[PDB]
Amino acid sequence: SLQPPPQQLIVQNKTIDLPAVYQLNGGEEANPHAVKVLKELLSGKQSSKKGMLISIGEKGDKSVRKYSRQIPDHKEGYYLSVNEKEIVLAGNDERGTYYALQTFAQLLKDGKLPEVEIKDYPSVRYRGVVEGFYGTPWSHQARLSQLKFYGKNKMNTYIYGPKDDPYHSAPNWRLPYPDKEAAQLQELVAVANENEVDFVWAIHPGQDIKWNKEDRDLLLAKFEKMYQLGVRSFAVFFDDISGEGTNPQKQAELLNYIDEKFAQVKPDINQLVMCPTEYNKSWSNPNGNYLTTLGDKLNPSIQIMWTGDRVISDITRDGISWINERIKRPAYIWWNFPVSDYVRDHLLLGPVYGNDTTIAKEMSGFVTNPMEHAESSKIAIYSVASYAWNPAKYDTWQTWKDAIRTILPSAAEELESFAMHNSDLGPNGHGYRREESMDIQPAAERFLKAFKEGKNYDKADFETLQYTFERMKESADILLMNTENKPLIVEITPWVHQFKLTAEMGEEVLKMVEGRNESYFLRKYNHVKALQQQMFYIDQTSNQNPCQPGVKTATRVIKPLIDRTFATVVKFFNQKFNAHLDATTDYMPHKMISNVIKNLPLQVKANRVLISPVVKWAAGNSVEIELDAIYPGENIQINFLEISTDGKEWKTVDLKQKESRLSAGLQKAPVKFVRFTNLRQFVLTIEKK
Numbered sequence: 154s155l156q157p158p159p160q161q162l163i164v165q166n167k168t169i170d171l172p173a174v175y176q177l178n179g180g181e182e183a184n185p186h187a188v189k190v191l192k193e194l195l196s197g198k199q200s201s202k203k204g205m206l207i208s209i210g211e212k213g214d215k216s217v218r219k220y221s222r223q224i225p226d227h228k229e230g231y232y233l234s235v236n237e238k239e240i241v242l243a244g245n246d247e248r249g250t251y252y253a254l255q256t257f258a259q260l261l262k263d264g265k266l267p268e269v270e271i272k273d274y275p276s277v278r279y280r281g282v283v284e285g286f287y288g289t290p291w292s293h294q295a296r297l298s299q300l301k302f303y304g305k306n307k308m309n310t311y312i313y314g315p316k317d318d319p320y321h322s323a324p325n326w327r328l329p330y331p332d333k334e335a336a337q338l339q340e341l342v343a344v345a346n347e348n349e350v351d352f353v354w355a356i357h358p359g360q361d362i363k364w365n366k367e368d369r370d371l372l373l374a375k376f377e378k379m380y381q382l383g384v385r386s387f388a389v390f391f392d393d394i395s396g397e398g399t400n401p402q403k404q405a406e407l408l409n410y411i412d413e414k415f416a417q418v419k420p421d422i423n424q425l426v427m428c429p430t431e432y433n434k435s436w437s438n439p440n441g442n443y444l445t446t447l448g449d450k451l452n453p454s455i456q457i458m459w460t461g462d463r464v465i466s467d468i469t470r471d472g473i474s475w476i477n478e479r480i481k482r483p484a485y486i487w488w489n490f491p492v493s494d495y496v497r498d499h500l501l502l503g504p505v506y507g508n509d510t511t512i513a514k515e516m517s518g519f520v521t522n523p524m525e526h527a528e529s530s531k532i533a534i535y536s537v538a539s540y541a542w543n544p545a546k547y548d549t550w551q552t553w554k555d556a557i558r559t560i561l562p563s564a565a566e567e568l569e570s571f572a573m574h575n576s577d578l579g580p581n582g583h584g585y586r587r588e589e590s591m592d593i594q595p596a597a598e599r600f601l602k603a604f605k606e607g608k609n610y611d612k613a614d615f616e617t618l619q620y621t622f623e624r625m626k627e628s629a630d631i632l633l634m635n636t637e638n639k640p641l642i643v644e645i646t647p648w649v650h651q652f653k654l655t656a657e658m659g660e661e662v663l664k665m666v667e668g669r670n671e672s673y674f675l676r677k678y679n680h681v682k683a684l685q686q687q688m689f690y691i692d693q694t695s696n697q698n699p700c701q702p703g704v705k706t707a708t709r710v711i712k713p714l715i716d717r718t719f720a721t722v723v724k725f726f727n728q729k730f731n732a733h734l735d736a737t738t739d740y741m742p743h744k745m746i747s748n749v750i751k752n753l754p755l756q757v758k759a760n761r762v763l764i765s766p767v768v769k770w771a772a773g774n775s776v777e778i779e780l781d782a783i784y785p786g787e788n789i790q791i792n793f794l795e796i797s798t799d800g801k802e803w804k805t806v807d808l809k810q811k812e813s814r815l816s817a818g819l820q821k822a823p824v825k826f827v828r829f830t831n832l833r834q835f836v837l838t839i840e841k842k
């Protein structure tokens with residue numbers, strides 16, 4: 154599967170050997186980055202004045218003069234030909250030549266090539282990745298790896314804008330990078346250039362920019378320092394800010410000044426891009442002219458970015474028509490997937506889909522905002538590269554599989570098994586979801602209805618569930634030990650552990666359903682309870698980020714199936730044997746009781762213990778939380794109060810107020826019980842770890 158698939162391809166059912174003796178024409182006149190690829194591929198073979206002719210060059214070079222009519226007249230276009238007589242690798246321009254060699258490399262298998270003729274070019278002018286997320290920015294080693302990946306997949310754009318880089322954003326955007334970081338950035342630029350990628354350095358100054366001479370000049374001096382490090386494309390982002398920096402006329406004037414005084418004065422600046430403050434339809438003022446002001450005032454060579462109809466959105470024909478009318482140019486898409494920076498407890502390893510495949514002419518560019526997990530994001534990146542190059546031939550499912558096979562050839566089926574059940578976001582404030590576990594969902598839902606009611610489930614369905622859990626454990630164990638992509642495995646490991654425990658829990662729960670005798674059932678029950686505790690421990694000790702800590706996996710179908718089946722089989726057991734087994738599905742070491750609320754589960758997040766968010770609260774009614782030990786208390790925050798260490802001797806804590814927010818410091822007071830007498834928020838913070 155050539156990826157991206159070329160615009161035009163004609164294959165014969167005929168094969169030639171990569172020639173043992175070859176005559177190279179154009180080695181000194183073609184793109185040296187393409188020539189390097191070709192020479193690596195011909196490493197074994199003999200350069201002669203006789204032997205099979207291989208011609209490499211750009212249109213205008215002597216080497217490819219015979220083939221000038223076959224070369225597409227498109228930016229980054231190429232013509233590739235292999236037949237028994239000769240090989241031709243001819244770009245319309247130097248990057249096109251490089252791209253011809255990336256296609257050529259995929260054609261070559263077991264020292265053999267198909268007889269083929271290809272004419273190829275990208276449908277979208279700028280294709281790539283915006284490292285534009287909140288969280289731990291990609292490591293330098295991760296970035297190196299990404300740039301090589303981009304060249305292989307014909308992505309020509311890498312926009313550097315990690316929100317947590319203080320020399321990119323708040324507070325130190327005005328300052329030059331310190332020496333260590335500057336040398337790293339210089340190396341990234343060099344490697345980008347070697348992989349035919351434009352390194353676009355972005356700046357995000359808007360939260361405290363002053364519309365005065367001093368800050369204008371400081372921005373330009375920072376761009377100049379980045380130009381000294383080799384940067385030749387630049388962006389200015391005004392997303393996710395408030396205040397004076399949101400002014401569109403001033404934004405447009407700044408970008409125009411950058412254009413006039415910098416981008417028009419250097420010999421070799423390529424992209425100049427801005428991200429607006431109103432960067433999706435839902436954030437656009439209905440009766441405001443923010444977007445029309447940018448559209449009319451911004452110099453027409455300057456690109457304008459757009460995330461779609463919402464912050465997290467798929468791009469439609471109606472949506473892109475809507476923006477294009479107002480900005481007076483084709484939008485440069487900023488696609489917010491697989492970015493997980495608002496659902497940091499989930500990996501998003503599913504296919505890329507949802508974007509209209511007929512709107513290439515309506516977009517200037519398409520870049521993906523990835524996860525902070527760089528290797529894991531390659532699944533989606535590979536897919537976006539395929540989409541943006543040839544959207545008319547974009548096959549979501551086959552591209553997903555191809556990506557996985559590319560990224561982890563040694564354990565591709567195991568990675569697919571894992572990714573199939575790690576693709577949904579769970580519930581979130583952006584409303585954005587993806588499909589997950591679709592294949593087993595029918596068997597899961599049939600089984601669970603039959604089970605709940607008074608019905609024999611289908612043996613096949615039970616077996617499909619067993620098969621799934623068995624395969625999950627195989628995939629987890631194989632992935633954990635895989636050393637072909639060690640950085641990938643480091644990223645996903647906490648989720649792999651959680652996924653394996655999920656599968657184990659599933660297996661034990663099905664053994665509870667198979668219901669042979671009382672003492673066996675209880676053994677399975679006790680084992681499930683232990684596995685629940687293990688899953689709680691992973692959740693509290695892994696991926697303890699400040700936003701959405703912990704580790705969730707197989708959340709759409711699998712975990713709900715297991716949890717519902719467990720609750721049901723425990724209910725039946727209690728009914729049948731007059732027992733009182735606990736039917737709770739998530740382990741929770743702390744306890745809460747209430748007359749009101751009563752069945753809202755407690756959560757533990759970092760050093761917070763909280764009740765899960767109209768409630769009718771009678772007089773003298775109370776909520777009581779018992780912790781599992783005595784801890785020093787930090788504070789209590791409540792949004793519509795006593796503490797103790799033994800439950801008997803109490804002490805009152807007076808809440809302060811500002812709007813609906815109630816709060817009180819506890820000054821390290823020992824706390825085991827918290828009681829309120831007479832909910833968007835109920836959170837105790839303790840001293841932990």
Ligand SMILES: *CCC(=O)Nc1nc(OCC)c2ccccc2n1
Nearest residue numbers: 287288316323393394494699700701
């Ligand atoms: C958990 C991290 C988080 O919420 N990050 C975040 N930060 C900012 O502000 C940058 C200082 C932000 C602004 C607007 C929208 C979302 C945001 N998320």
Ligand SMILES: [Ca+2]
Nearest residue numbers: 182183211214
């Ligand atoms: Ca040339």
